[PDB]
Design an enzyme around this catalytic site. Structure first.
Site, PDB file in Angstrom:
ATOM      1  N   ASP A 272     -40.257 -49.059 -56.139  1.00 37.90           N
ATOM      2  CA  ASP A 272     -39.115 -49.142 -57.051  1.00 37.90           C
ATOM      3  C   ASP A 272     -38.576 -50.573 -57.077  1.00 37.90           C
ATOM      4  O   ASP A 272     -37.856 -50.986 -56.164  1.00 37.90           O
ATOM      5  CB  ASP A 272     -38.027 -48.144 -56.649  1.00 37.90           C
ATOM      6  CG  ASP A 272     -37.490 -48.403 -55.272  1.00 37.90           C
ATOM      7  OD1 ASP A 272     -38.321 -48.541 -54.359  1.00 37.90           O
ATOM      8  OD2 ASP A 272     -36.249 -48.498 -55.102  1.00 37.90           O
ATOM      9  N   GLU A 456     -37.026 -57.100 -45.086  1.00 38.68           N
ATOM     10  CA  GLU A 456     -37.696 -55.943 -45.676  1.00 38.68           C
ATOM     11  C   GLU A 456     -38.972 -56.304 -46.438  1.00 38.68           C
ATOM     12  O   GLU A 456     -39.853 -55.444 -46.597  1.00 38.68           O
ATOM     13  CB  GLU A 456     -36.723 -55.193 -46.601  1.00 38.68           C
ATOM     14  CG  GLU A 456     -36.456 -55.833 -47.962  1.00 38.68           C
ATOM     15  CD  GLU A 456     -35.644 -57.139 -47.875  1.00 38.68           C
ATOM     16  OE1 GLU A 456     -35.559 -57.862 -48.893  1.00 38.68           O
ATOM     17  OE2 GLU A 456     -35.089 -57.449 -46.791  1.00 38.68           O
TER      18      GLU A 456
END
Length: 505
Positions: A272, A456
């Site tokens: 996403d 991340e």
């Protein structure tokens, strides 16, 4: 419990999110009512200052933990010292109306500022826990996922009410397999929950005729059965409400509900978002996840079916083992005849609209090697495409399209580094495998040298920079986990390294 805040708070929720009253759309998705939302709502409709009204009727998410580790730790000590720090227990909810779904056991979050736990990233976090001998934490998280399977019928995106309508890349069977390397009948113990998740993915398959789709399963014209990502709702994501509303407004020539479904389902895909899903990589309003059969997902399903067969053969159930073995065979056959791009020489998604396999190379192409569904010649072709096109100085690239989206060039993602290194190794492509490993390790170490943290995702065009990235120093699950696993691999077991060595051998 299970009513997501957008239905609970009705027009007040759309009002608060549209007013951009908070910088993050997730903030009000996590606001806990102080009384019955029916009262709050009736209160709201009469006395229409919105900021004060919200503060008096909701406890907003508390400014979370800003953990600072002592400086001067090596990369490995830094990671290892973080596992205890990111273990959290959310046993009860604050009241009946809290969006946080309570869980039986302690779980490990990606970062201290995370307010909930997610599905597929936990597997790579669990690789790190396994590596550093935290089996109880692993068993706690497998219990949590089994509880969710038994309570909700599937594993939600995360343990939030607004995630219940969708799942994520289905790594549970592989979590059980990991746990099984230490608690040897985990596979027998969790076979009931594995079977139930499998039923969630295949829901409706027996009723499908060639060319039909239903929720997360489809049937192609030749009968082949494959899965897709799918969210059961088709509203803006509560946690991204104004974003999705605006994204659908950007393309009024398609029903907003289709755009919402496809945005929700790309969030279920874990990517996403990505040009992988978009007709036009510049326009998120052109995303069409639910019309795309994903090759990574169907590699995972093959693995799930093989582990289901094995879990059955270990329980002495010959009929069930034999049934999953045939299902896994059909799945391998369908991957090879519909998810292989022969002209380009790599694995790729299948297009439901055009009924052809797609051209775009993404890092998902490594997934059939990862689960050992690929034939050797196709594995060798994927390796040639990998070093030629996806291998960049800082690790393996997610795609070759620099769209601005996060699951796209120039970002590298820890789970895809690991899937690439393992899948290539599976087929004897040790040189490329080690190249992926060394470059991502250099990227993680060099970024740790300059930022004293892990993040991340990483920019793979160089080494040393991550992202909008994770702002604390108590940093990130799957990067930590994959880094431990790879760091073990580039030094001898006899004398492990705590830092990435200067030179690859």
């Amino acid at each position: 419990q299970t009513t997501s805040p957008d239905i609970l708070l009705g027009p007040l929720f759309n009002d608060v999110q549209s007013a951009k009253l908070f910088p993050d759309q997730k903030t009000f998705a996590d606001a806990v009512p102080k009384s019955d939302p029916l009262m709050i709502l009736a209160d709201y409709r009469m006395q229409h200052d919105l900021r004060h009204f919200v503060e008096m009727n909701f406890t907003l998410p508390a400014e979370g933990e800003k953990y600072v580790p002592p400086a001067g730790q090596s990369l490995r000590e830094h990671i290892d010292d973080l596992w205890p720090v990111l273990t959290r227990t959310t046993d009860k909810a604050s009241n009946k109306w809290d969006s946080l779904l309570p869980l039986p056991k302690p779980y490990v979050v990606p970062g201290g500022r995370f307010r909930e736990v997610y599905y597929w990233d936990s597997y790579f976090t669990m690789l790190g826990l396994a590596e550093s001998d935290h089996w109880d934490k692993i068993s706690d998280m497998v219990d949590n996922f089994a509880y969710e399977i038994d309570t909700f019928g599937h594993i939600p995106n995360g343990n939030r009410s607004y995630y219940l309508s969708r799942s994520q890349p289905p790594f549970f069977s592989m979590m059980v397999e990991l746990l099984a390397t230490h608690d040897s009948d985990a596979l027998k113990k969790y076979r009931p929950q594995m079977e139930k998740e499998y039923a969630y993915w295949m829901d409706g398959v027996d009723a499908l005729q060639p060319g039909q789709a239903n929720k997360r399963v489809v049937k192609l014209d030749d009968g082949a059965i494959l899965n897709r990502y799918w969210d059961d709702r088709d509203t803006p994501r509560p946690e991204s409400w104004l974003d999705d509303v605006n994204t659908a407004k950007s393309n009024p020539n398609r029903p907003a509900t289709e755009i919402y479904r496809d945005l929700r389902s790309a969030a279920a895909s874990g990517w996403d978002f990505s040009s992988r899903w978009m007709d036009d990589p510049q326009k998120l309003g052109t995303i069409r996840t639910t019309s795309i059969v994903p090759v990574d997902l169907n590699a995972l399903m093959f693995k799930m079916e093989k582990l289901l067969a094995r879990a059955s053969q270990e329980s002495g159930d010959a009929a069930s083992a034999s049934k999953y073995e045939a299902l896994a065979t059909a799945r391998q056959k369908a991957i090879e005849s519909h998810l292989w791009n022969d002209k380009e020489g790599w694995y790729a998604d299948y297009d439901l609209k055009s009924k052809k396999v797609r051209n775009q190379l993404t890092a998902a192409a490594l997934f059939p090697l990862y689960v050992k569904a690929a034939a050797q010649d196709r594995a060798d072709k994927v390796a040639a495409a990998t070093s030629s096109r996806l291998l960049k100085p800082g690790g393996i690239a997610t795609t070759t399209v620099n769209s601005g989206q996060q699951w796209d060039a120039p970002n590298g993602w820890a789970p895809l580094q690991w899937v690439a290194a393992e899948g290539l190794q599976n087929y004897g492509q040790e040189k490329v495998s080690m190249d992926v490993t060394w470059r991502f390790l250099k990227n993680v170490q060099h970024t740790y040298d300059r930022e004293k943290k892990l993040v991340e995702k990483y920019d793979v065009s160089t080494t040393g920079t991550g992202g909008g990235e994770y702002p604390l120093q108590d940093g990130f699950g799957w990067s930590n986990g994959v880094t431990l696993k790879m760091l073990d691999r580039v030094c001898p077991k006899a004398k492990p390294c705590d830092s990435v060595p200067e030179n690859q051998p």
